[PDB]
Design a protein around this ligand. Structure first.
Ligand SMILES: COCCN1CCC(CNC(=O)c2n[nH]c3ccc(-c4cncc(OC(C)C)c4)cc23)CC1
Length: 350
């Protein structure tokens, strides 16, 4: 195909643009944001994703500012960004050139569902552990992703590396500064949001992660609501009716749903009989009504459900070694540095 040459600015480091050539553009996604393409870097031959968004010339793109400060093995990397012009007065596009990753958790999970099989729990551990690490990192800056779902969990199936993508809903949450409640993808939406809360925290992402974990264990979404309000009905069918205290802790803006009383369905009867007890226990501490009762991402990483990953003999099913799971920086551990003793086993220590 015809080569495109641009002058692009590196994601990290000082603003020093470089000539970049790419080719073989292919549309691979769209949304309210604009369009995402696959492309191939001419010089190195590496595939990349290019996220193209209409951007107002006189304002700053929030996703860009967030992407320029993130540097983590479980977060898709911003290689470069550049501006391109459309065929209209002041029609400017921001182009984000990101790492290409060949699969998603959604796609992998679906393969197992269609074959009427469960994803082996080793992959559930690996994928969930890496999601929680990515969340521990972004939360340490005060950034809440606000769109955790299987479709935004990229994976390389050969190395089992997971990378979080799509920071178009991400935001630095500030105590006392309101936020919109109609956020996140419905099935993964925290109950406080359904109650119209505008004063919420990063614990909304932990709820969404819990929904991902349950989905990988069940073979299908645990809370498949057909509307914003029916989402709460689905949650209630498992968790039971929230108490008045639990409702208060969710900081709701309305609660006039007039829900009939429903008993909680026991967590052990939700999943198949052979589900590991530690998976169930972890899940019960993520999917909690009271936001502050939920595990932090770092505490989730230290859960006994991930003990297999801390074993020195662990290997991937393809024979290869596990990716780097314990190379925690001081930033990643800042919420609770004493957890390093559990998070970093003897053989991984330096
Ligand atoms: C020949 O056919 C192959 C099809 N194949 C199917 C899986 C696919 C997985 N990879 C990615 O999505 C992928 N990689 N790097 C990214 C970097 C950014 C994004 C991304 C960021 N913000 C919003 C997005 O919105 C979509 C959710 C609509 C996507 C995705 C990505 C590879 C293409």
């Amino acid at each position: 195909s015809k080569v495109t040459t641009v002058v692009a600015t590196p994601g990290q480091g000082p603003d020093r643009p470089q000539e970049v050539s790419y080719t073989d553009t292919k549309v691979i996604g769209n949304g309210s944001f604009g369009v995402v393409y696959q492309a191939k870097l001419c010089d190195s031959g590496e595939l990349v994703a290019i996220k193209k968004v209409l951007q107002d010339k006189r304002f700053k793109n929030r996703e860009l500012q967030i992407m320029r400060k993130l540097d983590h093995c479980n977060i898709v990397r911003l290689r470069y960004f550049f501006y391109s012009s459309g065929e209209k007065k002041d029609e400017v596009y921001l182009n984000l050139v990101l790492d290409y990753v060949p699969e998603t958790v959604y796609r992998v999970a679906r393969h197992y569902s269609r074959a009427k099989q469960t994803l082996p729990v080793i992959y559930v551990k690996l994928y969930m552990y890496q999601l929680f690490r990515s969340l521990a990192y972004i939360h340490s800056f005060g950034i809440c992703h606000r769109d955790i779902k299987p479709q935004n969990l990229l994976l390389d199936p050969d190395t089992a590396v997971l990378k979080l993508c799509d920071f178009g809903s991400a935001k630095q949450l500030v105590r006392g500064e309101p936020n919109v409640s109609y956020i996140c993808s419905r099935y993964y939406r925290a109950p406080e949001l359904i109650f119209g809360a505008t004063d919420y925290t990063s614990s909304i992402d932990v709820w969404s992660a819990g929904c991902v974990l349950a989905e990988l264990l069940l073979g299908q979404p645990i809370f498949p609501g057909d509307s914003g309000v029916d989402q709460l009905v689905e949650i209630i069918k498992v968790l039971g009716t929230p108490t008045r205290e639990q409702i208060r802790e969710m900081n709701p803006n309305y609660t006039e749903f007039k829900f009939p009383q429903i008993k909680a369905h026991p967590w052990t009867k939700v999943f198949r009989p052979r589900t590991p007890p530690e998976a169930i226990a972890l899940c019960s501490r993520l999917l909690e009504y009271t936001p502050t009762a939920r595990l932090t991402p770092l505490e989730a990483c230290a859960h006994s459900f991930f003990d297999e990953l801390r074993d020195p003999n662990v290997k991937l099913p393809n024979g290869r070694d596990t990716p780097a799971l314990f190379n925690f920086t001081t930033q990643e551990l800042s919420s609770n540095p004493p957890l390093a003793t559990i998070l970093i086993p003897p053989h991984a220590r330096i």
